[PDB]
């Protein structure tokens, strides 16, 4: 019946920049407007890893096919797409130039570029991750691995001895709570110390560059540090990983507080991939300070250039940059964009809700849910000390969540509400 909209145009009315959350919004945008508008999508990476099930993926409760998704699958068939990143953006002219060099016009811009990973912030880190034997592990898989490479799952298993370091980069970084696996490894490494698999002379410390683990929710941040002390894990703040020497297994850390660097021997290194602010978003005068989008906390509309929006991780919102937060940010964007296409007012407000599971044990978890003011709901930090209630909620997220992201990208299942 309906003919596919064209991609060989000079201008559009809505333009989504991103595939992870920019694709789900476009799929939810067109279905609400019944395809009244012709929109274009321009992402940068061909593969979207489901970091929300990263820890069940490391436990191999999720196959690699259910963790690796293409970017085209998030976008519907009616709308055209192209894997070309934007080179520069002209908000005063309402146009966007791609890396190829073709100028494309727009009436509304939805920026979902998120936080771009930068492996080059740590010298030699990427090459030590891609190596199929080196004990350097990371938060995401390199794209050069085949389907038979399962090094990601050997971080907890192959820790027979040595010094172990869990490195947290400088905020803002992607995957704050959803990639915290120091509680599941502690329980498994407690078993290894019982029957001798783990040597009694081993060291594990959390190298956190920031001062706190959860920035915008102090209720959950106090719980983490309280539980880390009860477990016995040592934490070092204001220290960030700087260089990884693959030859002698040396890790260069630097205390950003005092500017003092040191060299430490490691045998099991895990680091969350650090982010990097994209320079073109600063040349166009859209970001502020740290490099995040300066938009309204309520309507997600930018301060200036009211035709430009922002959501996901790239937006500067006083909340945890999770995926369930994006479920409630696409409903607001697809609404307010619909209102500016008709000149109407903006009645969609974002309350700052964000939900992320915190794996407190090998097979138990608790939910970190909070509003804009850091206040949690009925689920916040409940059944946190393990038990049947915590065990059932774990199996529902480990065995029954990865199969749901297929419907999210297709369009069969919408957000929670």
């Amino acid at each position: 019946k309906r003919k596919k909209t064209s991609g060989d145009l000079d201008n559009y009315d809505v333009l989504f920049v991103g595939a992870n959350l920019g694709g789900i919004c476009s799929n939810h945008f067109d279905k609400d407007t019944h395809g009244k508008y012709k929109c274009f999508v321009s992402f940068d990476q061909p593969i979207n890893q489901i970091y929300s099930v990263r820890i069940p993926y490391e436990q191999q409760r999720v196959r690699k096919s259910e963790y690796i998704h293409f970017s085209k699958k998030s976008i519907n068939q009616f709308t055209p797409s192209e894997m070309l990143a934007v080179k520069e953006i002209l908000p005063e002219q309402n146009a966007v130039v791609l890396s190829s060099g073709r100028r494309i016009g727009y009436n509304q811009l939805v920026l979902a570029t998120g936080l771009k990973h930068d492996f080059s912030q740590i010298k030699g880190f990427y090459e030590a991750l891609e190596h199929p034997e080196h004990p350097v592990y990371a938060n995401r898989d390199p794209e050069t691995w085949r389907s038979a490479q399962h090094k990601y799952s050997k971080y907890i298993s192959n820790f027979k001895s040595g010094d172990g370091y869990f490195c947290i980069p400088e905020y803002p970084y992607a995957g704050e709570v959803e990639c915290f696996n120091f509680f599941v490894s502690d329980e498994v490494w407690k078993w290894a110390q019982h029957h001798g698999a783990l040597s009694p002379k081993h060291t594990f410390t959390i190298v956190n560059a920031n001062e706190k683990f959860v920035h915008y929710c102090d209720s959950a941040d106090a719980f983490i540090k309280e539980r880390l002390e009860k477990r016995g894990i040592r934490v070092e703040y204001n220290t960030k990983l700087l260089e990884v020497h693959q030859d002698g297994q040396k890790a260069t850390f630097i205390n950003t507080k005092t500017g003092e660097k040191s060299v430490r021997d490691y045998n099991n290194l895990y680091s969350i991939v650090p982010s990097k602010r994209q320079e073109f978003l600063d040349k166009a005068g859209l970001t502020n300070g740290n490099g995040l989008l300066n938009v309204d906390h309520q309507t997600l509309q930018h301060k200036k250039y009211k035709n430009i929006f922002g959501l996901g991780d790239a937006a500067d919102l006083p909340t945890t940059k999770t995926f369930w937060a994006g479920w409630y940010q696409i409903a607001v964007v697809r609404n307010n964009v619909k209102r500016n296409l008709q000149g109407q007012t903006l009645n969609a407000h974002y309350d700052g809700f964000s939900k992320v599971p915190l794996f407190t044990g090998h097979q138990t978890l608790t939910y970190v849910a909070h509003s804009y003011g850091g206040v949690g709901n009925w689920q916040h930090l409940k059944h946190n000390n393990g038990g049947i209630l915590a065990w059932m909620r774990y199996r529902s997220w480990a065995k029954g969540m990865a199969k749901k992201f297929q419907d999210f990208y297709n369009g069969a299942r919408l957000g929670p509400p």
Partner: protein, 60 residues
């Protein structure tokens, strides 16, 4: 000079107690799932292999 006539093509296996040590038990078999709990981990720790464990449970 027996090592001069030794054939290194037999190094494809490392046989010890009738078991090949270069066996990818982390990707194949009952030992592949990393979500095993304390009991299953301690059980594989004792026998080190699935072939020996299954052989004993056959009679037990």
């Amino acid at each position: 000079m027996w090592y001069k006539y030794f054939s290194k093509q037999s190094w494809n296996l490392r046989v010890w107690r009738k078991a090949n040590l270069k066996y990818n038990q982390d990707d194949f078999g009952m030992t592949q799932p990393k979500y095993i709990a304390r009991f299953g981990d301690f059980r594989f720790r004792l026998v080190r292999t699935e072939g020996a464990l299954r052989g004993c449970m056959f009679f037990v």
